[PDB]
Amino acid sequence: RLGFVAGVINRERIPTFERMLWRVCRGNVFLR
Amino acid sequence: QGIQQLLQAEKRAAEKVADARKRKARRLKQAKEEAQMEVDQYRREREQEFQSKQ
Amino acid sequence: KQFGPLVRWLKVNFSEAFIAWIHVKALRVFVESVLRYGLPVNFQAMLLQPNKKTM
Amino acid sequence: ADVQKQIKHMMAFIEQEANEKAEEIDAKAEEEFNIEKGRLVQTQRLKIMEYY
Amino acid sequence: TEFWLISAPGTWEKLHAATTKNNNLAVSSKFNIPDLKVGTLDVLVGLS
Structure with missing residues (x-):
C-alpha cells in the first residue's frame, strides 16, 4: 500500500544509524 | 536482491484487496436484483385478496 | 467499624490490580515478540522464574 | 543471511x-x-400497501 | 523479591527445559498465555 521514504546521510554515522534504527522500530524494516 | 521480490508480493496483495472490492460489489448488485423477488412475492400475495374481496 | 470494611476492600482490590498488572505484562510479552521474531502463525511462548545474586 | 530473515517477516x-x-x-x-x-x-411493501 | 520474565522463541519448547538444567540460575517454568487476536502492523507497534 505505502512504505517508501527516501533521504541521505553521511558515511561517518551510516553504521551507527542502521544499528540504532533496527532497535527503535523492533525490526520490520529493510534498510539498504 | 530482495527489494524486487518484496514489491511483487504487495502487487499480489493489491489484487487480493481489490478482489474484496470485486466481492463486496458483487454481493451488492446481486442484492438489488434479488430484491425483485419481494416484488414478485407481494404481487401474488395481493392478487389472492384482490379477487376474494372482488 | 471502618477498619474491617477497608481491610476487606484492600484485600480484594489490590489482588485485582496485581492480576491486572500481571495481565498487562503478558500483553507486553505478547507484544514485542511478533516483531522481534517472525509471525508465521504465532511465536513460541515461554517464560522464566526469579533468581537471587546470580543475575 | 540475517537480512533475509527480515524479508521473510515482511512477507508474512x-x-x-x-x-x-x-x-x-x-x-x-x-x-x-x-x-x-x-x-x-x-x-417495496409500502409502495404496494398504499396501492393495496 | 525480584522477578525476570523473558520469552525465547525459535523442539523449541524443549530448549526451555535446557535452561532448567542450569540449576544455579532458574527453574524455568512455562507460564503459558493463550492465543490472542492478531492482524495489525501499524496498530501493533502503536500499541507498544
Missing part, C-alpha cells in the same frame, strides 16, 4: 494485512447485504 506481515483488510470488506458484505435487503423489502 503484508499478506496478513492483505487477509485482514479483505475479510473486513467481506464482513461489511455480510452485515450490509441483509441490512439493504431488509430496508428494500420494507420499502
Whole structure:
C-alpha cells in the first residue's frame, strides 16, 4: 500500500544509524 | 536482491484487496436484483385478496 | 467499624490490580515478540522464574 | 543471511494485512447485504400497501 | 523479591527445559498465555 521514504546521510554515522534504527522500530524494516 | 521480490508480493496483495472490492460489489448488485423477488412475492400475495374481496 | 470494611476492600482490590498488572505484562510479552521474531502463525511462548545474586 | 530473515517477516506481515483488510470488506458484505435487503423489502411493501 | 520474565522463541519448547538444567540460575517454568487476536502492523507497534 505505502512504505517508501527516501533521504541521505553521511558515511561517518551510516553504521551507527542502521544499528540504532533496527532497535527503535523492533525490526520490520529493510534498510539498504 | 530482495527489494524486487518484496514489491511483487504487495502487487499480489493489491489484487487480493481489490478482489474484496470485486466481492463486496458483487454481493451488492446481486442484492438489488434479488430484491425483485419481494416484488414478485407481494404481487401474488395481493392478487389472492384482490379477487376474494372482488 | 471502618477498619474491617477497608481491610476487606484492600484485600480484594489490590489482588485485582496485581492480576491486572500481571495481565498487562503478558500483553507486553505478547507484544514485542511478533516483531522481534517472525509471525508465521504465532511465536513460541515461554517464560522464566526469579533468581537471587546470580543475575 | 540475517537480512533475509527480515524479508521473510515482511512477507508474512503484508499478506496478513492483505487477509485482514479483505475479510473486513467481506464482513461489511455480510452485515450490509441483509441490512439493504431488509430496508428494500420494507420499502417495496409500502409502495404496494398504499396501492393495496 | 525480584522477578525476570523473558520469552525465547525459535523442539523449541524443549530448549526451555535446557535452561532448567542450569540449576544455579532458574527453574524455568512455562507460564503459558493463550492465543490472542492478531492482524495489525501499524496498530501493533502503536500499541507498544
